[model samples]
Target: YIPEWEGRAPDSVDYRKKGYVTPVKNQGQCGSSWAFSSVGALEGQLKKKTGKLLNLSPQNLVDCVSENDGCGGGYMTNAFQYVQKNRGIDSEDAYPYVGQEESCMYNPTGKAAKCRGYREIPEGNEKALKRAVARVGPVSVAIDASLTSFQFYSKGVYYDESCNSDNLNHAVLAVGYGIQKGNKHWIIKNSWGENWGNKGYILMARNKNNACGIANLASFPKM
Candidate 1:
């Protein structure tokens, strides 16, 4: 279900190769993928514009964003808003993740990154999602990561037909897009640690009915 008539998207774009995407991380047992996705996007934008690769804390948002359910589940936009309102976020080293909810330990002294706001790609539009990831930088996205096929996705282009596009349950970052042997795919930066998937990244089916809802909730933070 690839769309037709591309406008300004590049043939290929990999923020990891451009030194914008940061190293993979793990959220462990907490349902904090949204926070990690939010932080990952912010970190990428900061690195792209300022050449700074700071380990911004997802735990900061997990604990401070009272609007969210913390370890249960949350929205990337809410996490982004937390950073925006705080004017900045702390480092991972200072406020490391504990895989669960805790009291807000927001210390401005450890603040390392700032986000003005976040921009969302048009709903269900891979064209806009690609343009944003290609031209802007890494973009945050929600996907159906609950399926067994997705849960055990280790390598190759992940294209499970059963991956629900309307049932997004986890968040991630789209760092780039490219074609492998003519099979187009999106390079998704995940938060399941380097040991999971392909070094904590998954090449998801691109232009395939917005597989896994990659474009349904696509967005990115602005520095």
Candidate 2:
């Protein structure tokens, strides 16, 4: 459910339009959506503040970040905490991506993007999500991306009632928000490549009971 907006949130905002979001990437068959979400937000924050779009490595998180389950499943919160504790994460060019779990190859001295910490947006609150996106760039969020419609989501606002909010399974990045045809929606960036959902982005129902668990585990990296 969309909560009352008390903060000075903009009517509309898009980090992609602001040139902070990086290019869409595919995670292959591995269930490493969590890593992609983490790196996507971190990359966005780094570019937003420093004007440097560094392509960080998600494979680093898959291999390292012992708190995660790697190719099976993972958590964005864990990935952010790992980056903060491990000094930082390596660049794509440095560590590279292989789409599978492997031994940790993180080099402490070769971190590409350093983070101070992360903050979580209160659960089931869309207004808080809007404020975070407007002020903190792209925010990482977990959602129930398990339905058939979600897998083939090409366009239009997504509002699957069958998607359980408490059983979230996939991670994504919320770049911004806007009102589409009087229906408020969140502009979501996915890790399934540009070929999926309106060029790797989807418009999810924003103020309708937190559709698809979008507001459950919302958070962003602090750079």
Candidate 3:
């Protein structure tokens, strides 16, 4: 479920809603955040168009793609590249869950079994991403940092890490932007278990350079 952050969340998006809300998923222990984020967006897009809540295959994406940094490593761009090289991601049932601890065992061969999906946006194309999300719904993005609070499941918006947090090697999804109460915030789904804060979600501030490019895109559904 999406949550309103503060009174200052994005008031209106650009395009009509093009995505769907999904049940929060557990990325398990695979540092394959890139795959999780990619699949999340793909799942949202597929669900938006088809209304099918498919348990996408993160293991397929994780093992097959070579470009993407696995297990707490990778760029939104690399994740997209993995998809494009391949047709798109597979169903989680097809591959089953391996997790961060699985030691990433797939190889890339430009096939779904070998690859996951595609990414098109070039570097410094955040504007393109903003437009995509406003019009489409959910878009994938890479934050400059991730919080310890984030490692834990959080529900509400109030991530105030001591002005400095390690954001590298983290990939996440940017669902719709919204405002709750009076603060402005962004709606983000996380990879942590639902037992974590906000049941594996976070609503960070929307304004003030909080996010960078929406790197991954499965314009079409994965299922």
TM-score of each prediction: 0.95, 0.94, 0.69
Per residue, candidate 1 scores C-alpha lDDT tens digits across 115-143 of 88888899999988888887778899999
True-vs-predicted CA distance for residue 122, candidate 2, Å: 0.5
Clashing pairs in 2: 1-209, 1-210
User: Which pairs clash (backbone N, Cα, C closer than 3 Å) in model 1?
Assistant: none
Residues 1-223 of candidate 2 have per-residue lDDT tens digits of 4533454677999877778888899999999999999999999988966888888999999999899899999899899899999988999988988988999999876688988889899999877888888877899999998899888888778888898999989999998989888788899999998899999999999989999989999999898
Residue range 159-223, candidate 3, lDDT tens digits: 56442423345666777666677766667777766665676667765554333322323232223
Evaluate all candidate structures by whole-model CA lDDT and list the values in order.
0.89, 0.89, 0.56
How many residue pairs collide in each prediction?
A: 0, 2, 31
Winner on TM-score between 1 and 3 is 1
Task: Tell me model 2's lDDT, rounded to 2 decimals.
Answer: 0.89
Q: Cα RMSD (Å) per model?
A: 3.5, 3.2, 7.0
- Positional deviation of residue 109's Cα in model 3 after best superposition, in angstroms: 16
Give the TM-score (vs. native) of candidate 3: 0.69
